[PDB]
């Protein structure tokens, strides 16, 4: 199952939920979210890695 | 006959070539003389053709200057048979100058056709020519714009028309007027002599006129008899010439075998032709190119092509009509740079192509630079074979490779092709065949509307989809092609369904349509390329159910008898289903009661009797902004009636004479479950009156008083033509005139007939006639009484 | 006023409002402010928050899915100007997927220096059509506002308006932000200087708003520069500019440069000085000096290399290109991909253009709004070391509007390695591609199907050669044309001429409806030629021809075309006159109304009209007008000649007047109550063999008179011995048309009155009338004449005794 | 155009010097019209 | 095309489900079977 924008945020804050999303500093690198979840299907670990605390 | 064959030929621009006719006797063809402008009369008094006798096809004269009498040039011209009629005519003379008289005293008869004379300001002696004696038909002539219009029969001032007696209708009259032979026509050297006939009425044979052609001689041009040898020689002469290829059928040397007949190599007979069996068309260069409708006009009726065809249409149904009768091509087929070719459907009946002559590169089918080409054929059913050769497919932007793959799988040329024979990246660049089926969930129909709902579909990125497109149209029969002309197929756009994350089906309901029809519907997706993920469904045929039919058309009722009324009508404009039957109601129309209180005896005695890239770009722009935002943001760690069946007419009996009747007509296309009957059509019809109904029946009873007062009591015809408005009384006394009186309905009712007072002494009479709606009836018997 | 508060560099808030309190004491933001990803919030949590101190934002403001927010008017009550130094995807203010947001509430924002506003996918936002962006932005068309509550739904923007209103397209509408505030509009004289409440103009340097009119010291934001509260257009030394919005002393720039150098932050820049500006790094041709931070011009041509991550970068927006600003040599590849619909050339050539060399390849894909590659102003070389896949260097794909590729009259170029590639450029001519093929020097490095022969310029006009119309003739409806022949080097290349024509009421007709005719090429004098058909007379038509040739890949045959030629067909007989109606307003006058012909076929010179008097029916003089029904009315072969010519040819006075410029006619001097025939025609040419249309016919009867029906003359009677009275009376010899009968009402003295009929034949044949069987006694006879119009006047009673 | 009206066309294009089946039934293209001029008339 | 003459369409689409009045979006706007589906209440 490949999920794309619009619904992707709704998928977020549910798998992630509760805590926020990690954001330190810009410091695009061309592999952010859409070519990782919309272009190709992504598992739960990739979505989890965008959480803040865990 | 001493002369030459003399094939038909024309003279123009001078009179020199006219001398070529000096050594001729019988013309086997048509003569056409036109455009003599530098001509003078004195140059034509020294020219004559006494040897010329017989003209086969027809004769045309136009714009002749100088000629005044044709008796010199054509002294002995006998008969214009009209074997080849110039549009039902055998002689056309138009726009003559200085031509004053006909001169042709030697024209007796024309076998078929008529004459056309027009715009001859000088021609005269037209009132002394008998066309009935000459031509068997005189109703087709058209002779106007001549000098005569602006009885003895004579051609010229010195030559008569040789007026034959009524017996010699076609035999002909000699110098003494005696009838000639039956085969003799118009004139004869000796009366009743077939050998001495100047002309042959039916057929000619070795100086003798005969009615028919005995075998082995066949009827040649319906004018002579020619054997098989000469007819076959003429056919061979045409065979190695440019043509009228002579064939023999029904003992006739006809220029072509008629419908359903085939030329046989062994014998000149026209055998029955196998099936449609039209023809075979050749190609010396084997390369005739089709540029437009006009170039394909000469291809009408061609089936077998003995060469190669190269289509180049720089442009619809026109080529559909011209083509579609072709089956096999001996050479190769090429289609090159045809802009207005949507599909090769028109090229229907093909099943094999030999390709003996090969396109350079050893190719049998060569398609190149075809832009709008979208389909080749309906390969699911249509059969095509290739005997040998290779295929070429380059620069065909709208033919995806599925059709090319079906090419060799149907034609059996799997190994016949080589690498690069079919281009990969140049064909079907705009064609988006993605062979993703769509299934319709359920469909329901009503007499006015029909509902459509199909299964949902989503490309991998649900934002790519940009609505559906529903195509529909009316399908006459069960088959239809999805590729019509470069039109039709009315379309409606569908908003994409909302992502339900159950599952909603897209669905669509039409708006208005024709009940009881066959509708072809199919749905096509509309997505934006990044790959292509389109989708389409098979052509679904739906049948809208029936409803109340339309009203009957043209209700006409006639009266044939005093009790019989004939009724005829037409089927309704909208049958809306197979019409089961018709319902006919007839109701006796009550007569106008007003006549019962109008005294018509006074004044008023008269009595009536009866464009797209922008939306895709907007969608892609929205999507590419969403992706940029997501990339930047995230970060990892009742009445009498009748049931008429299958009939359009009825006869109704049991109706009183001169009685009005209202007919209520309905059409019912259903019989048992509450017949759906249309709203009725109404018509008022009345029978004719009875002849004896208006006649008074009953002797007149008269009562004489002391003061010569007479009371008249006459029994009215209780069954009149409807009713009696008044009674007319014609009473006459001896020695007096027939005085007249009118007794109204009220006068008859209250006076019990009539009450006349103050009668002069003498013998009176009493004659009374009833006036029904039909008219006056019959006067009563004269009651003679002496007062 | 001054700026009381910190500068609070750019920042974003996520996942809780507790961080938002970092906006406590700052009035200007030196960067971008983002508030996004707010889920566990409700409107009661937002009512408390308010930031009156904040005035101006440097880069942009982005709101993305913040729940529980319904109006920013409480959040941002003093936002005035968005600087837009560094945009966010060529947007300065973004409102994306805002739920519960009912109204913007930014009633105080006035000017956005650079950028655009994009608000979409809200489903709850209205009060949008009641705002005026033209007075807020500079380029309105760059906006993009769709998919809200305003468009699909019908959120009623009820607001005071009291409040100023203005026109947008063709109608006036109020310009209000919320239900309680409206856009502040002031006279255009203060175009951007600002304007106080009463309308007095602010200071010239001022921007947006001010407290004291015409005073820089009392302003809230100024366009040029800021310094020490009282801001000036350009501060003098020792103050150096900074971030285009404020200038600072050298000590500040020096200490921040030291703070960046000692603290090795990955993002900090070694700020230097150049033209009294503390910019992060001066461009090529300068070297930073260790002694003084100002960078001195170097003694050598060392370009400023712009190293590219992963050897590739995609350009899709203004903020993507701005990363390359100031760079002149790229150590990577460039991929132009602008999915747009709005022009982006200006910002591109502002940010790009200083580029000279591309180490990698260049690829322009899917760009829609691109019109020319001219924004690469100073591009000279494409090394192509990082050659693109397929061994291509210059790549182009599906550019729907790429028209001009470069100005080859003056621009140089050089491609070291790789081969070109062009496909699906409908507005690009092959002439430009071949001109690159010559200039770049890659002539010998091209192969098959690397340049599409048909896709490039599918519908364009680059024949670059001309044709001359040798001879043109005009007529009734046929237009004969002949032009000089055109021959390519190989006559087989020519596939045929093709003509275009269209009616041209005006001069302004564009180049390249538009009826098309195909022409077969001529055989090799004999000018190709063609004749016209179905031309409406007296109409101007634009006509021009074109040439169709083969692919011509090896050669350079581009065909030719002629310029637009205007020719007007000659004139002719006009149509039938329209609306012919006739009314009699009097017994002698008649009026005629008509309309100009539907087909004028030329300038209508005049109208002609004939009037005549009809004749009464003869049967009206021998009809019985007192029998029943006496109601007098009141007022094939066609081709027989065709193939004949085929064989012959063989292959080798009523009164009238000239009515000018008037559609209303009045005619006098006519017999009263008489039928009249009117026939009118139009003539569009009078002096040279006058030409007139077909006749439009109508009939009109004049109004009846009154005394015409009435009997004139006394009544005479002659009585015989048998008491038979013959009556003589002169008839009205001038009646309304004619008199059909006379009624004679004769009565006895004290008895009834009887009516006698005297028809025309009764009066003529019998010479008057005769009454028979009249007993002696006084009488009274009146005579009435019944004319066509009606009945006359009864004559005086005839008193006599018989 | 057709018989009668094609006469105007052939006086038009010929100047001072088959039919009907080619312009009534078929298209009228000036290709046949010009070569139908009767120069030796 | 709206209220009064569209009742047949409303009873067509949902069959025997019934509806509640409001049509201002179909004689000025158009009907598209989505509003017709949601108008009929189960």
Author numbering:
A (entry chain D): 6 to 32, 37 to 63
B (entry chain A): 3 to 152, 179 to 270, 274 to 346, 351 to 521, 527 to 541, 545 to 573, 577 to 656, 691 to 717, ...
C (entry chain B): 1 to 161, 168 to 518, 528 to 539, 546 to 656, 701 to 717, 756 to 905
D (entry chain E): 8 to 24, 41 to 64
E (entry chain C): 8 to 29, 43 to 62
Task: Share the article's original sentences.
Insulin receptor (IR) is a receptor tyrosine kinase that plays critical roles in cellular signaling, growth, and metabolism. IR can be activated by two highly related ligands – insulin and insulin-like growth factor 2 (IGF2). Consequently, IR-B has an additional 12 amino acids at the C-terminal helix of the alpha subunit (α-CT), while IR-A lacks this segment.
The 3D reconstruction of class 2 (determined at 3.8 Å resolution for IR-A/IGF2, comprising 19% of the particles; determined at 4.2 Å resolution for IR-B/IGF2, comprising 22% of the particles) showed an Ƭ-shaped asymmetric conformation with three IGF2 molecules bound. The asymmetric structures of IR-A/IGF2 are nearly identical to that of IR-B/IGF2. This asymmetric IR/IGF2 complex exhibits similar architecture to the recently reported cryo-EM structure of IR/insulin complex at subsaturated insulin concentrations. Interestingly, in the presence of saturated IGF2, most IR-A (84% of total particles) and IR-B (86% of total particles) particles adopt a Ƭ-shaped asymmetric conformation, distinct from the IR-A particles in response to saturated insulins showing a single T-shaped symmetric conformation. Hence, it is reasonable to speculate that the predominant adoption of asymmetric conformations of IR in response to saturated IGF2 (about 84% and 86% of total particles for IR-A and IR-B, respectively) might result from the comparatively weaker binding of IGF2 at IR site-2. In the asymmetric state, one IGF2 is simultaneously contacting site-1 and site-2’ from two protomers, similar to the IR/insulin complex at subsaturated insulin concentrations. Therefore, it is likely that IGF2’s lower efficiency in promoting the T-shaped IR is due to its comparatively weak IR site-2 binding affinity.
